[PDB]
Design a protein around this ligand. Sequence first.
Ligand code: 3IG
Ligand code: NAG
Length: 333
Amino acid sequence: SSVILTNYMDTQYYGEIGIGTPPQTFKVVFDTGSSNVWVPSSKCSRLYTACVYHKLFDASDSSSYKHNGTELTLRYSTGTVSGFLSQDIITVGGITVTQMFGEVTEMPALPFMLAEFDGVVGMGFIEQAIGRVTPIFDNIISQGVLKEDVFSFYYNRDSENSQSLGGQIVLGGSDPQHYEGNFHYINLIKTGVWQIQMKGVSVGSSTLLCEDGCLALVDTGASYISGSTSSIEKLMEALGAKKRLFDYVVKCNEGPTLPDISFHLGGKEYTLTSADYVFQESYSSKKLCTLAIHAMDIPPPTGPTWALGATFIRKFYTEFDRRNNRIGFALAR
Ligand SMILES: CCc1nc(N)nc(N)c1-c1ccc2c(c1)N(CCNC(C)=O)C(=O)C(C)(C)O2
Ligand SMILES: *[C@@H]1O[C@H](CO)[C@@H](O)[C@H](O)[C@H]1NC(C)=O
């Protein structure tokens, strides 16, 4: 099954899922970086403006709802949400599964007031699941209906017209229509996390980073490519970028000429061009242009680690192989 995704400003990719009976619709991000499912709850106080602006699941309207109530808190690198567990049936592109999810009652204005999506569907392993809740993909696998024990991601480049699909997730395989050439796999450092060994990072013709090796979390839920603060400072220094509060800018007229950035993964160099990582919104030297690469210190046990997000997947179609505990990459088409 494939799920059509909407692309919002190249930073948000989300699709629809149905919860309850009758189905209550929600826009959600499919996140390989987390392992829980959650949507805003009707029990979320309207004092949380984010709840006033998103779809709210109302258990009292679903006949398939099963109460639980265990509280849980989900912590992401850029924000936190809190609530309680509930069980109901969920629709994901034709597949139906009974799933335990979180009803969020505390949704911070910053950053959720900036979210086009309502919730999140974690595609990670149960090892990282908060409350030890069985992840949705595991429940799907349990049905023995998927052709293959894998899921893939396609994140299109932003578009000014509504004729192009923002992206696409495939449960059970990959869509040959959105990649070309062959997949090149890398084994997961360890099952339980969509993280792989990265052999090196280069800026221009000089592998000046991640020498001696480092970690790379392949995170479909992250908007950008991130690295430790030290790594980024070094990388950004080589680009001549200026560190801002939340990001890094560069004189727009300078954007088109920034050097290539490569990521050495499993014996293959994955190269991004300035066009691939800078939001080229102008060529003016009197304006600043943001880079789709940020600094982010991911704490243990998962980090320190670099994170390959939308900026990376936009260029390389990505297959997540559960059965073989490896990740596949192929040039996106
Ligand atoms: C999708 C959940 C999520 N998972 C992971 N692994 N890391 C995160 N930083 C986030 C996370 C949290 C809050 C967010 C966003 C992401 N995102 C990006 C969502 N990612 C995609 C690919 O759409 C946002 O835009 C704002 C609103 C800041 O709020
Ligand atoms: C919630 O689900 C977990 C999973 O087994 C269970 O242990 C717990 O008792 C449930 N909570 C309630 C009271 O429904």
